Amino acid sequence: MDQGGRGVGAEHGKYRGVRRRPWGKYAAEIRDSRKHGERVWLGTFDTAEEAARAYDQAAYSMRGQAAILNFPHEYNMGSGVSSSTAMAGSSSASASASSSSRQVFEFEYLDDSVLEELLEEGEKPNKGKKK
DNA sequence: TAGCCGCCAGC
DNA sequence: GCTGGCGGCTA
């Protein structure tokens, strides 16, 4: 976690789950508790705030419960299935000026969300249980 | 500009 | 040993 980072910095402005290149591009990669450190690449982001979130998805997936991530936002949607109010309300007003503006990925961020609930992307039944 | 690699390093 | 992130060559 902070461990890999100390050379650049024990703890600093950029987030956990993040790499920095000379141009400044940011890079998403994860390894598995269970596969002994093999690396699969979740993606690549410019963005540091949604960075933690790229790792969010991945790491909700891996721990399984009480996932180890920065921040605490929990989201509940009601009543539905039919929650246009909650999409629009939670979304507005959340924005990053430089990154979201790249275009098209505005559409996917603008309706939702900021923090999402996903389940065991990491495991394939049958696998009970992890470590 | 991006990805994979490889040591190494703090929790 | 955990799990990231440095880290810098090559892809």
Numbering used by the authors: 1 to 131
The authors write:
APETALA2/ethylene response factors (AP2/ERFs) are a superfamily of plant-exclusive transcription factors involved in the ethylene-inducible response. AP2/ERFs contain a highly conserved DNA-binding domain consisting of approximately 60 amino acids, specifically to recognize the GCC box at the upstream operators of defense-related genes, such as pathogen-inducible PLANT DEFENSIN 1.2 (PDF1.2) and PATHOGENESIS-RELATED PROTEIN 4 (PR4). Arabidopsis Ethylene Response Factor 96 (AtERF96, AT5G43410), a member of ERF group IX, contains an AP2/ERF domain and an EDLL motif, and positively regulates defense responses against the necrotrophic pathogens Botrytis cinerea and Pectobacterium carotovorum. In summary, we have shown that AtERF96, an AP2/ERF-family regulator recognizing the GCC box DNA motif, is an ethylene-responsive transcription factor that directly modulates the defense-related gene PDF1.2a.
In this study, we determined the crystal structure of the AtERF96–GCC11 complex, including an AP2/ERF domain and an EDLL motif at a resolution of 1.76 Å. The three-stranded antiparallel β-sheet fragment of the AP2/ERF domain binds to the GCC11 motif and crosses the adjacent major groove region. A linker consisting of eight residues (A10–G17) connects the α1 helix and β1 sheet, gripping one strand of the DNA double helix between the α1 helix and the β1 sheet of the AP2/ERF domain. Residues R16, R31, and R39 of the AP2/ERF domain interact with the phosphate group of base G15, as well as the guanine group of bases G6, G15, and G16. The α1 helix contacts the template strand of the GCC box in the 3′ end region, resulting in a conformational change of the template strand and slight flipping of the ten nucleotide base pairs from C7 to G16.
